[model samples]
Target chain A: MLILTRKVGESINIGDDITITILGVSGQQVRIGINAPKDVAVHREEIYQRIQAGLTAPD
Target chain B: MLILTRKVGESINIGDDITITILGVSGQQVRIGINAPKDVAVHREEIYQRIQAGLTAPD
Candidate 1:
C-alpha cells in the first residue's frame, strides 16, 4: 500500500485523470471528494455487496 | 441471497423503506437506483477503504 499524507484540500491524482481529495476530518469520520469519469461505478462496500448479492442469484 | 428479478424501472423494497431499483442494464454494466433516508452514507468500496486507510494512520 502506498502511504501518502494529505491534509484537507490536498489531493492525489491517479494516472491521467481520477483525483481523490481530502475534504475534511472530524473525530472518527473523514470526508473525501473524488473526481472520476461518469462511467466509473462507485459503491460502498456493504451496499455494494448487498447489491451484488441481489444481482448474482438466480431470478 | 434473496434471488429476484426486476425489470428496468422495477424496484424491491427492503423492510418498510429503502428501495433498490433497476434503472438500466447494458451488457456488463448495470445502472441501479437506491432510495433511502438522508442519514445513510453511500460510497464506493475502494474509496471507502482508501479513506479508512487515511483515518487510521496518525495525521
Candidate 2:
C-alpha cells in the first residue's frame, strides 16, 4: 500500500478525471471529498458494499 | 450521514454484500479494510480518482 499524508483541504489528483480532497481531520476520524465524472463511480468502501447489497446505478 | 465507531477487527456489514473492518489505528490515522464481491468496487478516495484518470477495469 502506498501511503501519503494530506492535511485538511489538501488534495491528491489521481489524473484528469478525478480529485480526492482531504476535507477535515479530527482525532481518529477524517473527512474526504471525491470528485469524478458521473460515468466513473465513486463510493465509500462500505457504501459500495451496500450497493452490491442493492444500491447506486451510475449514469 | 450515519456514523458508527468501531475498533480494530470490528466490522460493519453492508447488508450481506460488503464488510468494512477496522484493521489498525495509530493516532489520527486509522487503517481500514474493505470486503466486497467482484461486482462492487471499493476504493480508497484518491486511488479511485486514479482509476477515473485511467485505471481499474472491473472484470
Candidate 3:
C-alpha cells in the first residue's frame, strides 16, 4: 500500500485523463474527488472490492 | 480518494488483524507491505481493477 502526501487543493493526474483532487483534509479524515471520462467507471474502495469479488452491484 | 502520510517504520492497524507498514521511501517511489489473516485478500491497484472488472485470473 504505497502512499503519498497531497495537501488540500492539490491534484494529481493519472496517465492522461484520470484526475484526483484533494478537496479538504483534517485529522483522520479527508475529502477527495476523482474525475475521468465516462468510459471509466469510478467506484469507492469497498464497492470496488465487492464488485471485484464477483458480487452483483447494488442500485 | 483518501490520503495519509506515513514515514518509514510506522505501522497502521485496520480493524483487528490487518496491518500495513511503511517499509521504505525514495523520491517519487515507496516500498510498502501489508499483512492480514489468510482469509483476507490483498492486491495491487491495477490488478485489482482488472480482476474487479471480470477478467479471468491468469495462471
Interface Cα root-mean-square deviation for all models: 17.2, 7.0, 9.9
CAPRI grade of model 2: incorrect
Candidates in order, TM-scores: namely: 0.42, 0.45, 0.45
Better candidate by DockQ, 1 or 2: 2
lDDT of 3 by residue, B13-53 (tens): 44333445555544434444555565544454344455556
What are the DockQ scores of the candidates, in order?
0.03, 0.11, 0.07
Best by lDDT: 2
TM-score of chain A of each: 0.71, 0.70, 0.72
Weakest lDDT window of 10 consecutive positions for candidate 2 chain B: B1-10
Q: What TM-score does candidate 2 reach?
A: 0.45
Query: Which lDDT tens digits does candidate 3 get at residues A1-59?
Result: 33445455655444334455555533434444556566444444333443445444555
DockQ score of candidate 2?
A: 0.11
What value does DockQ give for candidate 3? 0.07
Worst 10 residues of 3 chain A by lDDT: A43-52
Rank order (by TM-score, best first): 2, 3, 1
Tens-digit lDDT track of model 2 for A1-59? 22344445555544344455555555655555555566455445555655665445533
Q: On a 0 to 1 TM-score scale, where does candidate 3 land against the true structure?
A: 0.45
Per residue, candidate 2 scores C-alpha lDDT tens digits across B1-59 of 23344444555544345444556555555555555566545455545655665456565
Runs of candidate 3 exceeding 4 Å displacement: A1-59, B55-59
The residue-by-residue lDDT of candidate 1 on A1-59, one tens digit each, is 22333454555443233445555544433444556565444433344556567563345
